[PDB]
Design a protein around this ligand. Sequence first.
Ligand SMILES: CCn1cnc2ccccc21
Lengths: 156, 39
Amino acid sequence: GETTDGVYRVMTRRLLGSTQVGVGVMQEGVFHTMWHVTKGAALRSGEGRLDPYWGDVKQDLVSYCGPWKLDAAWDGLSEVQLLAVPPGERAKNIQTLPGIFKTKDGDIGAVALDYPAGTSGSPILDKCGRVIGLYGNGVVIKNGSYVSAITQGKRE
Amino acid sequence: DMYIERAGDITWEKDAEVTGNSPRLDVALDESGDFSLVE
Ligand SMILES: CCn1cnc2ccccc21
């Protein structure tokens, strides 16, 4: 199937018509997405099959064909871009200054942008075009707005 | 049966639309990977 680096939609034909359940990143031959998008199922790419290789429900991440390859991190100061891929709509870059999720185990950058659930797995990038995490695991705050963590895995 | 379809390159775009605020929130992450607000 298609192994070219880039951002991809994750589709299913199990529901009505063809439905976009999420998004992912192909980098160095490995497909990266959030666990809640695929639930760890195998994926098809044309006539080819992508099998899960690593995953973790708590991190809400999964990699296919190989180990997690994305290791860039938000520098804690600069604006970033969400490369949003919404269902049925063209990929679009949105620039924003992240906020912060403060936890008992440390602080994480967060992006206050609200897209449909099927946009989960869209990449967040730095000024060098490096993926610093994936969008789509977050919280609903006081005024009812959605804020996503910038979720990044560990490159072994 | 899930399948993937290419949607684009991963590149920073100059003069992209700039929006979104930057909230600082106290959150908790449970064993199921769900975030919740801590008050
Ligand atoms: C409140 C749920 N929600 C809203 N927008 C989303 C985008 C990705 C994942 C979940 C989302």
